[PDB]
Each structure stands twice: as structure tokens, then as C-alpha cells.
Scaffold this active site. Structure first.
Site, PDB file in Angstrom:
ATOM      1  N   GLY A   7       4.536  -9.790 -28.441  1.00 24.12           N
ATOM      2  CA  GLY A   7       3.229 -10.340 -28.733  1.00 24.12           C
ATOM      3  C   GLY A   7       2.835 -10.113 -30.178  1.00 24.12           C
ATOM      4  O   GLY A   7       2.024 -10.856 -30.703  1.00 24.12           O
ATOM      5  N   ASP A   8       3.400  -9.082 -30.819  1.00 22.13           N
ATOM      6  CA  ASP A   8       3.143  -8.821 -32.230  1.00 22.13           C
ATOM      7  C   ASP A   8       4.250  -7.962 -32.830  1.00 22.13           C
ATOM      8  O   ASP A   8       5.261  -7.710 -32.173  1.00 22.13           O
ATOM      9  CB  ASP A   8       1.767  -8.158 -32.415  1.00 22.13           C
ATOM     10  CG  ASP A   8       1.736  -6.693 -32.005  1.00 22.13           C
ATOM     11  OD1 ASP A   8       2.691  -6.186 -31.368  1.00 22.13           O
ATOM     12  OD2 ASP A   8       0.702  -6.040 -32.289  1.00 22.13           O
TER      13      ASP A   8
ATOM     14  N   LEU B  30       3.105   1.800  -2.131  1.00 22.39           N
ATOM     15  CA  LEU B  30       3.297   2.052  -3.553  1.00 22.39           C
ATOM     16  C   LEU B  30       2.107   2.829  -4.102  1.00 22.39           C
ATOM     17  O   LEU B  30       0.973   2.596  -3.697  1.00 22.39           O
ATOM     18  CB  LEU B  30       3.486   0.726  -4.306  1.00 22.39           C
ATOM     19  CG  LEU B  30       4.689  -0.122  -3.866  1.00 22.39           C
ATOM     20  CD1 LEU B  30       4.788  -1.439  -4.623  1.00 22.39           C
ATOM     21  CD2 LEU B  30       5.977   0.659  -4.017  1.00 22.39           C
TER      22      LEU B  30
ATOM     23  N   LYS C  52       0.802  -1.225   0.000  1.00 24.86           N
ATOM     24  CA  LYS C  52       0.000   0.000   0.000  1.00 24.86           C
ATOM     25  C   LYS C  52       0.845   1.291   0.000  1.00 24.86           C
ATOM     26  O   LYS C  52       0.342   2.379  -0.288  1.00 24.86           O
ATOM     27  CB  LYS C  52      -0.960   0.012   1.196  1.00 24.86           C
ATOM     28  CG  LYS C  52      -1.999   1.140   1.109  1.00 24.86           C
ATOM     29  CD  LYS C  52      -2.987   1.129   2.251  1.00 24.86           C
ATOM     30  CE  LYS C  52      -3.952   2.298   2.131  1.00 24.86           C
ATOM     31  NZ  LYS C  52      -3.217   3.602   2.026  1.00 24.86           N
TER      32      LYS C  52
ATOM     33  N   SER D  91       7.166  -3.572 -28.009  1.00 23.70           N
ATOM     34  CA  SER D  91       8.067  -4.298 -27.118  1.00 23.70           C
ATOM     35  C   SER D  91       9.417  -4.589 -27.776  1.00 23.70           C
ATOM     36  O   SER D  91      10.444  -4.634 -27.096  1.00 23.70           O
ATOM     37  CB  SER D  91       7.425  -5.608 -26.644  1.00 23.70           C
ATOM     38  OG  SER D  91       7.087  -6.429 -27.749  1.00 23.70           O
TER      39      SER D  91
ATOM     40  N   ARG E 125      11.713  -1.770 -27.134  1.00 19.43           N
ATOM     41  CA  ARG E 125      12.079  -1.805 -25.720  1.00 19.43           C
ATOM     42  C   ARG E 125      13.023  -2.962 -25.361  1.00 19.43           C
ATOM     43  O   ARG E 125      13.326  -3.185 -24.182  1.00 19.43           O
ATOM     44  CB  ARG E 125      10.817  -1.876 -24.849  1.00 19.43           C
ATOM     45  CG  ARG E 125       9.859  -0.692 -25.116  1.00 19.43           C
ATOM     46  CD  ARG E 125       8.829  -0.495 -23.997  1.00 19.43           C
ATOM     47  NE  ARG E 125       8.149  -1.742 -23.646  1.00 19.43           N
ATOM     48  CZ  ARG E 125       7.064  -2.211 -24.253  1.00 19.43           C
ATOM     49  NH1 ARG E 125       6.508  -1.553 -25.268  1.00 19.43           N
ATOM     50  NH2 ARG E 125       6.530  -3.350 -23.840  1.00 19.43           N
TER      51      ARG E 125
ATOM     52  N   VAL F  56      -1.694   1.487  -5.295  1.00 16.51           N
ATOM     53  CA  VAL F  56      -2.191   0.474  -4.374  1.00 16.51           C
ATOM     54  C   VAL F  56      -2.899   1.132  -3.184  1.00 16.51           C
ATOM     55  O   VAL F  56      -2.287   1.895  -2.434  1.00 16.51           O
ATOM     56  CB  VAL F  56      -1.041  -0.425  -3.881  1.00 16.51           C
ATOM     57  CG1 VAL F  56      -1.556  -1.522  -2.956  1.00 16.51           C
ATOM     58  CG2 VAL F  56      -0.295  -1.025  -5.079  1.00 16.51           C
TER      59      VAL F  56
ATOM     60  N   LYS G 280      -6.561  -7.496  -0.492  1.00 12.17           N
ATOM     61  CA  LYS G 280      -6.539  -8.637  -1.401  1.00 12.17           C
ATOM     62  C   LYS G 280      -5.165  -9.281  -1.384  1.00 12.17           C
ATOM     63  O   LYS G 280      -5.034 -10.501  -1.443  1.00 12.17           O
ATOM     64  CB  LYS G 280      -6.945  -8.200  -2.815  1.00 12.17           C
ATOM     65  CG  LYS G 280      -8.428  -7.820  -2.915  1.00 12.17           C
ATOM     66  CD  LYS G 280      -8.875  -7.523  -4.349  1.00 12.17           C
ATOM     67  CE  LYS G 280     -10.411  -7.452  -4.496  1.00 12.17           C
ATOM     68  NZ  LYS G 280     -11.076  -6.351  -3.733  1.00 12.17           N
TER      69      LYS G 280
ATOM     70  N   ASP H  48       0.799  -4.298 -36.730  1.00 13.20           N
ATOM     71  CA  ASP H  48       0.239  -2.957 -36.728  1.00 13.20           C
ATOM     72  C   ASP H  48       1.218  -2.059 -37.461  1.00 13.20           C
ATOM     73  O   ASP H  48       2.407  -2.097 -37.170  1.00 13.20           O
ATOM     74  CB  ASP H  48       0.044  -2.434 -35.300  1.00 13.20           C
ATOM     75  CG  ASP H  48      -1.004  -3.208 -34.520  1.00 13.20           C
ATOM     76  OD1 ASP H  48      -2.050  -3.570 -35.107  1.00 13.20           O
ATOM     77  OD2 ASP H  48      -0.764  -3.460 -33.317  1.00 13.20           O
TER      78      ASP H  48
HETATM   79  C1  C6T Z   1      -2.611  -1.066 -26.490  1.00 15.34           C
HETATM   80  C2  C6T Z   1      -1.989   0.329 -26.507  1.00 15.34           C
HETATM   81  C3  C6T Z   1      -0.781   0.585 -27.185  1.00 15.34           C
HETATM   82  N1  C6T Z   1      -0.269   1.827 -27.168  1.00 15.34           N
HETATM   83  C4  C6T Z   1       1.000   2.068 -27.836  1.00 15.34           C
HETATM   84  C5  C6T Z   1       1.971   1.721 -27.033  1.00 15.34           C
HETATM   85  C6  C6T Z   1       2.414   0.313 -27.440  1.00 15.34           C
HETATM   86  O1  C6T Z   1       3.701  -0.040 -27.022  1.00 15.34           O
HETATM   87  C7  C6T Z   1       2.241   0.437 -28.960  1.00 15.34           C
HETATM   88  C8  C6T Z   1       2.112  -0.974 -29.640  1.00 15.34           C
HETATM   89  O2  C6T Z   1       0.890  -1.563 -29.195  1.00 15.34           O
HETATM   90  P1  C6T Z   1       0.913  -3.078 -28.698  1.00 15.34           P
HETATM   91  O3  C6T Z   1      -0.515  -3.494 -28.443  1.00 15.34           O
HETATM   92  O4  C6T Z   1       1.542  -3.904 -29.813  1.00 15.34           O
HETATM   93  N2  C6T Z   1       1.828  -3.122 -27.286  1.00 15.34           N
HETATM   94  P2  C6T Z   1       3.419  -3.666 -27.108  1.00 15.34           P
HETATM   95  O5  C6T Z   1       4.151  -2.633 -26.131  1.00 15.34           O
HETATM   96  O6  C6T Z   1       4.139  -3.858 -28.489  1.00 15.34           O
HETATM   97  C9  C6T Z   1       3.371  -5.270 -26.219  1.00 15.34           C
HETATM   98  P3  C6T Z   1       3.293  -6.765 -27.270  1.00 15.34           P
HETATM   99  O7  C6T Z   1       2.692  -6.305 -28.588  1.00 15.34           O
HETATM  100  O8  C6T Z   1       4.698  -7.243 -27.484  1.00 15.34           O
HETATM  101  O9  C6T Z   1       2.481  -7.862 -26.628  1.00 15.34           O
HETATM  102  O10 C6T Z   1       1.144   1.110 -29.091  1.00 15.34           O
HETATM  103  C10 C6T Z   1      -0.882   2.801 -26.496  1.00 15.34           C
HETATM  104  O11 C6T Z   1      -0.375   3.902 -26.491  1.00 15.34           O
HETATM  105  N3  C6T Z   1      -2.013   2.633 -25.826  1.00 15.34           N
HETATM  106  C11 C6T Z   1      -2.572   1.404 -25.817  1.00 15.34           C
HETATM  107  O12 C6T Z   1      -3.748   1.175 -25.115  1.00 15.34           O
HETATM  108 MG    MG Z   2       3.369  -4.925 -30.004  1.00 17.01          MG
HETATM  109 NA    NA Z   3      -0.601   3.638  -2.151  1.00 15.42          NA
HETATM  110 NA    NA Z   4       0.556  -4.025 -31.843  1.00 17.27          NA
END
Ligand code: C6T
Ligand code: MG
Ligand code: NA
Ligand code: NA
Ligand code: CL
Ligand code: CL
Ligand code: CL
Ligand code: NA
EC number: 2.7.7.7
Length: 326
Positions: free
Chosen positions: A180-181, A53, A51, A171, A174, A56, A63, A247
Site C-alpha cells: 500500500g506504500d 478461534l 467461535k 509489507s 514480508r 471470535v 453475524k 514513511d
Molecule cells: C499502522 C501501524 C503500523 N505499524 C507498523 C507496522 C507496519 O507494518 C509498519 C508500516 O506501517 P504501514 O501502515 O505502512 N503497514 P504495512 O504492513 O506496510 C501494509 P501496506 O503499507 O502495504 O498497506 O508500521 C504498527 O506497528 N502499528 C500500526 O498501527
Molecule cells: Mg506500508
Molecule cells: Na473464540
Molecule cells: Na507506511
DNA sequence: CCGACAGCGCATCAGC
DNA sequence: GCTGATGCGC
DNA sequence: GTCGG
């Protein structure tokens, strides 16, 4: 992942609030709490400790105490056992099926993968493709595959017009070991905040990626944003790679830094950074950072010549992409 | 207590 | 057809 | 659900 059990629990609560309760602010509250705990560098011993943080509060603290004591949450136990909630939660895992459509399908007795498959005529185009690749879209992408996909996309884009610049964000940018995509930022000098001096800029790139059979399907497509499906080519006698989500976002070339900040994320990082902007009296989108006047109306775009400029304005020390995974 | 919670693209629909 | 709201997505 | 004022 010192606190995996807790952040999993909060994420499950988030998903419940989003998909079943349709309470988006509760969803985001839980995700924010999961995020802050995820990077907290101690194995949490109590709700009172958590809490401290930000994000939280009392309810989540309680929980966490229940979870630490027993290894579970009764509230989640019940949710897992509820058929309507389990069905709705499941259906939302199909791309294009959200909380509203999911509840509507469950209303008509459509509540399993089988039900979806037999009722393909009741799905819009996005949902049909989401169903088609349901298995594939829950798989992760090894960074090694992300690098092959990068190579293809950047080289094909170059063949269309050598003045395009394609940047893989999300990602991947980063530094994640799996994604994930694939998220691709696109610029072309013909498209700026001042003018579009050439039509079909996104279309041309999509069409080329389709023609070499990289892009296989389209979920949605407009003048600046493509949402679809892609696939790496496989060798002779090799099992095919899974289909992947892709995307693509075309951004005005002079607004590249705001565009790359946005598309690099994370989403929670963006929400935190834009919230902080507001507190500092600015608003940030994928195009501009602008001051807020006394009324709350946004002013003119401030000059931006680097990602760091954006951090400077809101008085944040610069954070490299790899440190933005919130 | 209570207002705010990031900001925006594309698909679909209702109302005209 | 357009405009604005809503759903789903980034 | 949490938080700032
Ligand atoms: C879903 C989402 C994405 N974004 C931006 C940030 C994100 O890093 C970028 C790509 O979207 P993503 O859904 O592919 N997210 P990711 O960081 O690439 C994580 P993942 O695709 O590897 O699972 O779009 C937002 O600003 N608001 C959002 O609600
Ligand atoms: Mg992505
Ligand atoms: Na807090
Ligand atoms: Na995406
Ligand atoms: Cl809510
Ligand atoms: Cl649990
Ligand atoms: Cl703008
Ligand atoms: Na979905």
C-alpha cells in the site's frame, strides 16, 4: 481467501466502529477476528465453528451465521444506506481526515469530494495533500515498482553518507506481491541510544530525495519520523506513475532489531506480539524489550542482537517476516 | 463480572 | 514560549 | 467485542 466474504464483513464492521462510532476497541476486536479467520485454513461452515478461534465470540459468531445463511448482514445493509455514516466513512479515506474531523466536516455540510475541493481553505496541510492525491493513494504498488523505489532510495541515501543503512520494511519486507506504500527504516552510526553526534540526519536524506524529485510532498516531519509523498520517474512519452505514500523512520543504530521488528509488522502482528510480551512479563517498543517488575514499571533494556532474540524472550518460535502478515 | 485491550511520533490547540 | 491533551498517523 | 482470571 477461503473466507473472503466473512473477513470483508468484519472489516466493514471494524471500519464503522472506528470511523462512525469512534469505538476503537470494537474496531480492534473486529480486526483481530478478521485476522484470525483470514489464516484459518478451512472454508468456515458455521458461527459455532468460527467461535472456536480466539478473538471470535458470541456476537461475531451470530453475524457469521446470518452471513452464511443469507450472503449479507442486515446491520451492514442499514449502515450502507445511512447518509451520515456513509459520508463520515468516506471522508476518513482522505489522509489526515480522521473520525473527528470527518464528523465535523459532515456537520458543516462538507461531505463529498467536490465539497472538499471547494473548501480547500478549511483543510490543514496534511489534509490538502491527502485530497490532492486521493485517487493515487488508494492504488496498490506492484512489487516491481517497490523494487525500483528501493533502488532509488538506497542509492540516494548512499550518496549522502555511505554509512547510512536504509531498509525497506512493511509489507515489502514480508514479501508481499503488492504494497500500500513504502516504509523505510534508516540508521546512521552517529545516532545511537547513547548520543546524537550529528544533527539533521533525517532531514539530509529527505532533502536529497527531494532534490532528485523522488519525494514530492511532506505530510509531517520531525527529527526521527518523516511522513510524505513520492513518485517514480517515468520515461519519455510515458504516463506518469501514481504518487505514493512514503514513511521513513530513523532509529538508533544499536536498536536496529527492535526497530526493524516494529516497522516490518504487520500492525496486527505487532499488537499480538506486544500483547503476548505483556503476558510473559515484558514490554516491547521499537527501541527495546524490557522486563516488567511486580509493580508494572518497566526495567532496563535487555540485550538484543537479532530479531530472534526478541522472540526468544517471550517464548515464541521465530517467525520469518513472510509469516507475520496478520 | 470487569478491567484491559501496543506503544509511540508529529501537528494542533487550550491554558498558562 | 512551554506543557499536556487530543487527533491522526506509523 | 472478546477474553482471562
Ligand atoms: C499502522 C501501524 C503500523 N505499524 C507498523 C507496522 C507496519 O507494518 C509498519 C508500516 O506501517 P504501514 O501502515 O505502512 N503497514 P504495512 O504492513 O506496510 C501494509 P501496506 O503499507 O502495504 O498497506 O508500521 C504498527 O506497528 N502499528 C500500526 O498501527
Ligand atoms: Mg506500508
Ligand atoms: Na473464540
Ligand atoms: Na507506511
Ligand atoms: Cl470501544
Ligand atoms: Cl453485507
Ligand atoms: Cl525504550
Ligand atoms: Na484518513
Amino acid at each position: 481467501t477461503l473466507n473472503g466474504g466473512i473477513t470483508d464483513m468484519l472489516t466493514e464492521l471494524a471500519n464503522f466502529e472506528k470511523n462512525v462510532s469512534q469505538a476503537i476497541h470494537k474496531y480492534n476486536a473486529y480486526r483481530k477476528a478478521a485476522s484470525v479467520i483470514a489464516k484459518y485454513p478451512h472454508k468456515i461452515k458455521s458461527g459455532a465453528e468460527a467461535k472456536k478461534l480466539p478473538g471470535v465470540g458470541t456476537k461475531i459468531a451470530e453475524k457469521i451465521d446470518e452471513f452464511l445463511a443469507t450472503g449479507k448482514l442486515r446491520k451492514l445493509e442499514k449502515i450502507r444506506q445511512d447518509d451520515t455514516s456513509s459520508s463520515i466513512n468516506f471522508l476518513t479515506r482522505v489522509s489526515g481526515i480522521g473520525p473527528s474531523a470527518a464528523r465535523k466536516f459532515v456537520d458543516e455540510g462538507i461531505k463529498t469530494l467536490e465539497d472538499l475541493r471547494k473548501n480547500e481553505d478549511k483543510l490543514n496541510h496534511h489534509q490538502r495533500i491527502g485530497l490532492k492525491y486521493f485517487g493515487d493513494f488508494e492504488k496498490r504498488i506492484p512489487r516491481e515498482e517497490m523494487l525500483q523505489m528501493q533502488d532509488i532510495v538506497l542509492n540516494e541515501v548512499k550518496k549522502v553518507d555511505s554509512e547510512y543503512i536504509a531498509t525497506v520494511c512493511g509489507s515489502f519486507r514480508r514479501g508481499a506481491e503488492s504494497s500500500g506504500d513504502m516504509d523505510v527504516l534508516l540508521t546512521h552510526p552517529s545516532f545511537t541510544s547513547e548520543s546524537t553526534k550529528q544533527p539533521k540526519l533525517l532531514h539530509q536524506v529527505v532533502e536529497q530525495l527531494q532534490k532528485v524529485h523522488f519525494i514530492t510532498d511532506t505530510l509531517s516531519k520531525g527529527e526521527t519520523k518523516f511522513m510524505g509523498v513520492c513518485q517514480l520517474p517515468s520515461k519519455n512519452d510515458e504516463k506518469e506513475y501514481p504518487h505514493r505514500r512514503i514513511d521513513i523512520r530513523l532509529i538508533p543504530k544499536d536498536q536496529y532489531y527492535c526497530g526493524v521488528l516494529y516497522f516490518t509488522g504487520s500492525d496486527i502482528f505487532n499488537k499480538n506480539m506486544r500483547a503476548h510480551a505483556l503476558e510473559k512479563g515484558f514490554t516491547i517498543n521499537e527501541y527495546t524489550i524490557r522486563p516488567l517488575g511486580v509493580t508494572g514499571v518497566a526495567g532496563e533494556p535487555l540485550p538484543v542482537d537479532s530479531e530472534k532474540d526478541i522472540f526468544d524472550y517471550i517464548q515464541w518460535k521465530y517467525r520469518e517476516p513472510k509469516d507475520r502478515s496478520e
